[PDB]
């Protein structure tokens, strides 16, 4: 049965520029602008030269949320109309971005397209282009991809085609005026995941540690994102864990914070909590009665115990790697073994490149946790899983993990303060300003007290890098007080009016100091912050938006 190929004239957009996210608009410029979906995704396929498109195929994958489904629907008329040969795409449109990455390098596809929204879209709507190496398109790819969408006259889209999303397996179209039938792969969502998550962790160990009357008690909210369906179908069904283990588990098409995983470890029953928010980002491991994990640390602690995990247990570690911001703590492991640690700036995609040339296979970001180089994407199911293997070879609670750690390494005490919505002309003077404080001669050297608590400047910097992959060079990634006993002072503004993040890290050696609140071993750095970044008298906040 012929479908037809048409050729719709269209007026180009003139905001369609992705960046390391993809293209994130409110979900009303989706439905009040005639095309906008179109023109972007065909906008995208173009960077695909056409003698290339019969033999790629695209993994295209979705949030769960309202939407989606017509959203993959209309990639689909258009990729088969552009000639692209195959779409693979998760069944009922699921899959998560760790499953698309997954997928993408599994079966060498030229990319795929990410689709994804927020919590109640009454309220936005993402689409990100990722590439062969399964991460996301790069600064070059997205330049062409704004450079096409602004230019674009005309789209090319198979109306009539639909495709059955919920059914697995192969679908064919036969398109009228070309010899290949254009094919659409219906894959099960978590299938391709767990395979390769069997084969970094030992689900022997694990099933052993989460069946049998001695066993592991665990509590993982997924918030109604695309992770539940990966949490139930790994940690329950696979692994062994009962099924009021996993909470939250089917993802909501319709409708912030965390507490009620605080609220349920307070008890005492579970052992181990993990939750994670909707996007499937920022996220949160508490142990037994509430004991909170700083995502920095975790970095640490498993790094320090990263052979209990076969995959680089067989691997090796090729190299460990932390962003700018994010604590001290990973340093403190990788010096005393001889893995190079680098230092990048805020962004998955500089870990990415590392992985890429073979250099990085652990690494960090203090707002998300751990990840390593066995996809091109965060993974918090691969982060639950590392803690999971640890605990399960040292047979000790969290919270003697993380005490046995700091007594061998020291504690690299650490918050961020979030300023939100703040007025952007001082923002912008209150680093500006701070900025000349620290170029100064006599800087340098510099010491503040705060309750007998000696600081002293060892160096004052406006964070440079430059990619050794890929050649750029990214300036003004935030500025950074270094003290001499190894803590740190980091202030960043960060793109819906500005934001502020002001992070603290403290390094005690003091055993009788490592179990200590952190916002009272902080104290002393935080006034030290504030005083020199004049941040209040700029900005008029007494208080940051978010403490965490």
């Not at 489904?69 to 008329?77: D, F, G, M």
């Not at 894959?187 to 030992?202: K, N, P």
């Not at 022997?204 to 009357?213: D, F, I, M, T």
């Not at 994407?377 to 691969?382: A, G, I, S, T, Y």
Request: with cysteine; charged share 25%.
């Amino acid at each position: 049965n012929m479908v037809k190929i048409v050729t719709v004239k269209t007026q180009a957009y003139q905001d369609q520029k992705p960046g390391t996210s993809g293209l994130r608009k409110r979900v009303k410029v989706f439905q009040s602008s005639a095309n906008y979906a179109e023109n972007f995704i065909q906008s995208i396929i173009s960077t695909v030269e056409p003698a290339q498109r019969q033999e790629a195929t695209l993994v295209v994958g979705g949030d769960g949320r309202f939407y989606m489904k017509e959203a993959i629907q209309l990639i689909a008329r258009i990729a088969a109309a552009n000639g692209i040969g195959r779409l693979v795409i998760g069944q009922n449109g699921i899959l998560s971005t760790p499953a698309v990455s997954c997928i993408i390098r599994k079966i060498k596809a030229i990319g795929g397209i990410i689709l994804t929204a927020s919590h109640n879209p009454g309220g936005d709507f993402g689409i990100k282009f990722n590439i062969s190496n399964g991460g996301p398109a790069p600064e070059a790819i997205t330049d062409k991809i704004f450079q096409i969408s602004k230019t674009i006259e005309e789209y090319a889209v198979c109306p009539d085609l639909k495709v059955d999303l919920g059914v697995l397996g192969k679908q064919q179209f036969d398109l009228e005026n070309k010899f290949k039938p254009f094919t659409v792969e219906i894959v099960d969502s978590v299938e391709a995941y767990a395979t390769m998550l069997r084969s970094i962790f030992d689900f022997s160990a694990l099933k052993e540690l989460l069946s049998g009357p001695n066993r592991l008690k665990i509590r993982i909210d997924a918030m109604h994102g695309v992770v539940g369906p990966y949490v139930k179908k790994i940690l329950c069904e696979e692994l062994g864990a009962p099924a009021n283990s996993a909470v939250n588990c089917v993802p909501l098409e319709d409708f912030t914070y965390a507490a009620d995983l605080v609220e349920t470890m307070k008890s005492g029953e579970h052992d181990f909590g993990a939750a994670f928010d909707g996007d499937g980002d920022r996220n949160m491991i508490l142990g037994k009665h509430g004991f909170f994990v700083n995502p920095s640390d975790s970095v640490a602690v498993i790094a320090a115990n990263i052979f209990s995990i076969p995959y680089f247990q067989q691997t090796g570690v090729r190299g460990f790697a932390r962003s700018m911001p994010t604590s001290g703590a990973l340093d403190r492991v990788a010096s005393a073994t001889k893995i190079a640690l680098y230092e990048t700036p805020t962004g998955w995609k500089f870990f990415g490149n590392l992985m890429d040339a073979s250099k990085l296979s652990l690494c960090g970001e203090e707002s998300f946790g751990t990840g390593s180089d066995h996809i091109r994407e965060k993974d918090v199911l691969w982060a639950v899983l590392a803690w999971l293997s640890i605990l399960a070879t040292r047979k000790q609670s969290v919270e003697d993990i993380l005490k046995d750690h700091w007594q061998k390494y020291g504690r690299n005490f650490f918050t961020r303060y979030d300023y939100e919505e703040v007025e952007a002309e001082g923002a912008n003077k209150m680093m500006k300003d701070l900025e000349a404080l620290m170029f100064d001669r006599s800087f340098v050297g510099k010491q503040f007290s705060a309750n007998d608590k000696v600081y002293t400047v060892e160096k004052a910097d406006n964070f440079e890098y430059s990619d050794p992959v890929d050649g750029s060079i990214s300036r003004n990634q935030g500025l950074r007080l270094i003290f001499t006993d190894g803590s740190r002072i980091v202030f960043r503004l960060s793109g819906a009016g500005a934001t502020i993040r002001l992070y603290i890290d403290s390094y005690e050696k003091d055993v009788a100091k490592i179990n200590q609140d952190p916002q009272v071993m902080l104290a002393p750095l935080i006034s030290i912050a504030l005083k020199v970044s004049q941040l209040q008298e700029r900005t008029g906040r007494t208080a940051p938006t978010v403490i965490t």
